[PDB]
């Protein structure tokens, strides 16, 4: 399945973490407060993060401080609150990694209590 698909959450809902590693784009699943539930192979190839070492940590506080801003983290909380997280925008990842421009797609998961952050290079 492709990045930005209109029903991407349906497709990923039925995938085990083994299949998540096969996606063409980065995929991070977070709970309502931003804690990392899943972190696929594609994302680690972009950021250099070891899934083993980031799963369980908080994305906005510990792992990705540059995303702790109104336009990323702020948008995330608004979507968690409204129950309708679904937005795509461009961003630059630069903490402990070479500055990398990406396109981000945040979307609520089907469980309704977990959320997706999808990433691809631009």
Provide the binding-site residues for ligand HC4, judged by CB under 6 A. 28, 43, 47, 49, 63-67, 93-95
Backbone angles phi, psi at 60, to 5 degrees: -75, -30
CB 84 within 8 A of CB 76: no
Helix (H, G, I), strand (E, B) or coil at 47: helix
Beta-carbon contacts of 49 under 8 Å, excluding residues fewer than 6 positions away, are 39, 43, 63
Nearer to ligand HC4 by C-beta: 102 or 109?
A: 102
* Strands 36-39 and 86-93, bridge-based pairing: unpaired
Q: Which parts of 1-122 fold into alpha helices (H)? A: 8-13, 17-20, 41-47, 51-54, 75-82
């Amino acid at each position: 399945v492709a990045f930005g698909s209109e029903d991407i959450e349906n497709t990923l809902a039925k995938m085990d973490d083994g299949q998540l590693d096969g996606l063409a784009f980065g995929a991070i699943q977070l709970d309502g407060d931003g804690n990392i539930l899943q972190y696929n192979a594609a994302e680690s190839d972009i950021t250099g993060r070891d899934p083993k070492q980031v799963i369980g940590k908080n994305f906005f506080k510990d792992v990705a401080p540059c995303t702790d801003s109104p336009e990323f983290y702020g948008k995330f909380k608004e979507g968690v609150a409204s129950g309708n997280l679904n937005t795509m925008f461009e961003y630059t990842f630069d903490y402990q990694m070479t500055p990398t421009k990406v396109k981000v797609h945040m979307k609520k998961a089907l469980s309704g209590d977990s959320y997706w952050v999808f990433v691809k290079r631009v």
